Design a protein around this ligand. Structure first.
Ligand SMILES: [Mg+2]
Ligand SMILES: [Mg+2]
Lengths: 613, 204, 205
């Protein structure tokens, strides 16, 4: 609970608090709270105010709470969260490993706070993990330090529900309004969402990550025994059933159910029976989940609370997919390479050096040719506080715009034609320049198998002065529209290379509209990671990659502002990428992507195989 | 090892020979490797290697290749890091510059004979009439690799004929903070599952 | 500086120390040190012993140093390096990020020592970075934490010089001998080097 004080506008932020002419008007908002809310059993921590500087009055009211009710502690944040007007330390937005110094109000690192000379109090965070748009990246690193150290205690997540308002058009259909669009000046135009769910209510994708790291059971594997440990403090395990399943490539072999009962703060060992070993290639996966059988007051029957996955002993493929008896044929022109095989054929535009048109039928498979891609639509965690009038150089979007990633273009260097005994090999190199400075280098080889599949190998090379690029991959525009998509990898939600601790590796099936996640502010969405097989319509893709298929393009998400003004384009845009950047973050105005997950190797490699039917 | 496949290819300006291998033991397949050989028209050679490691056997030591050259020279010339030795976990001391030394300083005689003398992060290697380009780690020695494992003292080693040369792509940190428990930290182990490297042989 | 006490063989390692029949023979090796080395300006930290368990005698001599010379601190290692017989924490071979638990004598992580409930003293390591053969790997990670945190202070490196002995063959040429090759039983055959330089002297890499 909290009184009603905030003075976040004055210069400096302790003018109306330190001056003692304002003591009567300020001490009628704390006294008349305590006399209203002191019988209830729920409130355990009082708090004075938020973002109002430090002064003498915040020391004056503190003994007034601590002298008329001694059974609860008192918490206060502003001024650095160390002063005499508090009992438990509570910084806002403090990082985990790195630290940043300011004049006169530092924010030290969370492991460094406790070891300063003469410090004994605990530490509960008041605000962490800002959550606008795609966020809650790097969330898993907090919940290792929260369980290893004894004296850290946890934190509070900003914020739960959106703040949107509705408004009607001339058709009668509504659309969610935001910020300063009613007709006021001035405004701030994006900082009103702060969403973990929508305003309906209907859950974001970002919630099911926070469900997983906060679970009440912890599991650990050893040999052939599984170990279950608890995290309750008062309750005995009355209704819990364990549910185990072994899996090979989407085909089940063994399953079972074991009843469970653990003491508080105890341990239990569960012995697994023998499991049959397969003969073909594959990685054996093990999945364990926890199910309640009866209905409580706050849940129905059949609720799920905890899960965990591991990798078991495996076996690797030995034989070779060879061979077939069909031989491809090729022929040349001054604009196009024509490589056919029976019904199916391929064409190569000379000047772009790209795949111009692929054929099944008598049917146009594609419109836009096969091309590399090096960027994304700017999310909220890299737009900063920059706008069209005031600029800021430390944000990511202004550095990329400054160097010229969005503007640069390619120039061709070399394409050669080769004919093997069973295949053909077409080699092509490219380079991207801007204002006379050479940005990026790429070299790729195309191989056309005799069976019917295609083998593509890519070698990219990045200069060391320009800032680090967003993605490394390629995209295209398919012409047919289907109903469902089928991927073999991770699911069922979305996930990024920094937020992937929540999924499990299994087969999944969904229709098309669930892949697009409509945010209120339109940006990039819907990448699936770690997959090994992709199936859509009549087409097939194999390798190790990250992907997203969408109805919408990539440029139109960058240009517009609202979510009700998007229109559907024809065809389906498909985007396949090799290596990708974490999103963070812990603030939204300073960059907060951690250094381990950036893209700074200098050299990279990836391989993929196209296939029909 | 057991061989699987080798094919011969003739381009317009080059030739391409493709070869795959696999290593097994007691009926369980340990390691997989696939490599391509390309012979340029200028005089140089281009070699590309793709290796693949199973996920149950513990993590291997190095990933590379070695050979036995027949001529003996006086000095070696490398372009990269120097002048001492360095490993991928102990490399904060060198600087990136040209260096020149005679042969005997490359072998560091410990009293207990073991592995020694890898140079890391280099970009050019020159010894005698030969030339190697890419991005790699290397050591050239008078001694073999097996005889360092077998014996016990340092005064009982004898010199073999020729020069053994060893070139490696990716390598393991050594630690450590104890000597009875393992102490190599988890960040510098070799657990990706897939790896890639490329190198170019050249004469004169 | 250090007195002359080590009892690393008995079972358990506090038999000859906790039993008070051995107090006179043990308190003639600390008293006659302090009266020999107290005028010099170089010594700044006294130390009782190494690897000898914990008992009552190590609490008994501690006030005897801290009552006849108050101008220097007193350091002691064994038993977990937390007990009442010391003033500055000194674990041996403690790691930096991961930790390993033992029964009854843990070795917690070096950033985790200072944040336990009711702990205020500094921390100087007594032994770190064992150095036989190719070693001193991962050494750079200590010297980031030594400069970021205020209250850590540094450590001591084992060991400086090799312990080799010479012996002659029939040719007259020498070779460095090690361990149990003279003709004794038993032996340990590699743990005598611990080298940062050779025995000449000539520096390691
Ligand atoms: Mg405010
Ligand atoms: Mg000892």
């Amino acid at each position: 609970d909290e009184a009603n004080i905030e003075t976040h506008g004055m210069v400096p932020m302790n003018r109306l608090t330190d001056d003692p002419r304002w003591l009567p008007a300020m001490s009628e908002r704390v006294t008349r709270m305590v006399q209203r809310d002191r019988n209830h059993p729920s409130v355990i921590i009082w708090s004075l105010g938020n973002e109002s500087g430090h002064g003498a009055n915040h020391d004056a009211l503190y003994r007034w709470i601590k002298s008329v009710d001694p059974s609860r502690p008192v918490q206060y944040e502003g001024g650095g969260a160390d002063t005499t007007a508090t009992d438990i330390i509570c910084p806002m937005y403090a990082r985990v490993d790195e630290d940043q110094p300011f004049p006169a109000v530092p924010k030290w690192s969370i492991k460094k706070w406790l070891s300063l000379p003469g410090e004994t109090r605990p530490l509960i965070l008041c605000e962490y993990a800002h959550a606008m748009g795609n966020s809650l990246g790097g969330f898993a690193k907090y919940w290792q330090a929260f369980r290893q150290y004894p004296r850290l205690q946890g934190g509070f997540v900003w914020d739960w529900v959106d703040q949107s308002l509705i408004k009607y058009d001339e058709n009668g259909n509504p659309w969610s309004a935001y910020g300063g669009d009613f007709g006021d000046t001035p405004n701030d135009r994006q900082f009103c969402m702060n969403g973990l769910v929508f305003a309906d209510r209907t859950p974001h994708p970002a919630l099911t990550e926070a469900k997983h790291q906060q679970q009440f059971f912890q599991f650990r594997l050893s040999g052939q025994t599984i170990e279950v440990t608890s995290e309750y403090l008062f309750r005995h395990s009355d209704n819990e059933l364990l549910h185990w399943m072994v899996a090979l490539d989407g085909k089940p072999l063994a399953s079972g159910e074991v009843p469970l009962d653990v003491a508080p703060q105890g341990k239990q060992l569960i012995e697994l029976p023998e499991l049959p070993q397969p003969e073909s290639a594959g990685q054996l996966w093990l999945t364990v989940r926890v199910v309640q059988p009866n209905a409580t007051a706050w849940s129905e029957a059949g609720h799920i609370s905890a899960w965990q996955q591991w990798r078991l002993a495996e076996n690797l493929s030995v034989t070779l997919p060879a061979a077939s008896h069909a031989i491809p044929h090729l022929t040349t022109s001054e604009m196009d390479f024509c490589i056919e095989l029976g019904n199916k054929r391929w064409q190569f535009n000379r000047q772009s050096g790209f795949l111009s048109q692929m054929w099944i039928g008598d049917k146009k498979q594609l419109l836009t040719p096969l091309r590399d891609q090096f960027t994304r639509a700017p999310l909220d965690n890299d737009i900063g506080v920059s706008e069209a009038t005031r600029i800021d150089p430390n944000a990511w979007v202004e550095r990329w715009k400054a160097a010229g990633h969005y503007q640069a273009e390619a120039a061709l260097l070399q394409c050669t034609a080769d004919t093997l005994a069973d295949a053909v090999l077409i080699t092509t190199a490219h380079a991207w320049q801007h204002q006379g400075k050479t940005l990026f280098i790429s070299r790729k080889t195309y191989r056309i198998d005799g069976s019917g599949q295609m083998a593509i190998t890519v070698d990219v090379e990045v200069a060391s002065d320009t800032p680090h690029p967003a993605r490394i991959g390629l995209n295209c525009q398919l012409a047919q529209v289907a109903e469902r998509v089928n991927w073999l990898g991770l699911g069922p939600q979305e996930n990024y290379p920094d937020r992937l601790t929540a999924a499990c590796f299994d087969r999944w099936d969904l229709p098309l509209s669930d892949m697009y996640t409509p945010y209120v502010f339109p940006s990039e969405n819907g990448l699936r990671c770690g997959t090994r097989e992709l199936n859509y319509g009549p087409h097939q893709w194999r390798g190790d990659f990250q992907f997203n298929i969408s109805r919408y393009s990539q440029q139109q998400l960058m240009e517009t502002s609202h979510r009700h003004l998007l229109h559907a384009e024809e065809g389906t845009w498909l985007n396949i990428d090799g290596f990708h950047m974490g999103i963070g973050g812990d603030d939204s105005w300073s960059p907060s992507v951690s250094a381990e997950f950036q893209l700074s190797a200098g050299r990279y490699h990836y391989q993929l195989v196209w296939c029909q039917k």
